[PDB]
């Protein structure tokens, strides 16, 4: 069929932060193959002028929101792996 690319699962934002963020996500994987420093790359990337602290996670499903709930958070496949990024104080 006629694919696309990184897919997004739950993101609840602007495409703005949701769009420049799943950008450094995408361009991140499509960038380093350390899934661990892709993610951590990510947060760094953001958290570092933006607000931070930022955690990410890199498992393969997050199943929480009414128990962890955070302030901006974006769950979605990059390349061919989960990520689950959200900034939690």
């Known amino acids: ?5 990184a897919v997004i699962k739950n993101a609840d934002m602007s495409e703005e932060m949701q769009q420049d963020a799943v ?6 994987l499509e960038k380093y ?26 498992g ?6 009414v128990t962890h709930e955070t302030r901006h958070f974006i769950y979605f496949y990059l390349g061919q792996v989960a990520i ?5 104080g």
């Not at 689950?84 to 939690?88: E, P």
Request: charged share 30%; with cysteine.
């Open 60 to 65: 393969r499903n997050f199943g929480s929101y």
């Open 84 to 88: 689950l990024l959200f900034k939690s």
């Open 23 to 28: 950008d450094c996500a995408t361009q991140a």
């Open 33 to 58: 193959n350390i899934e661990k420093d892709i993610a951590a790359y990510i947060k760094k990337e953001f958290d570092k002028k933006y607000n931070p602290t930022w955690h990410c996670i890199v």
């Open 1 to 5: 069929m006629s694919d696309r690319k």
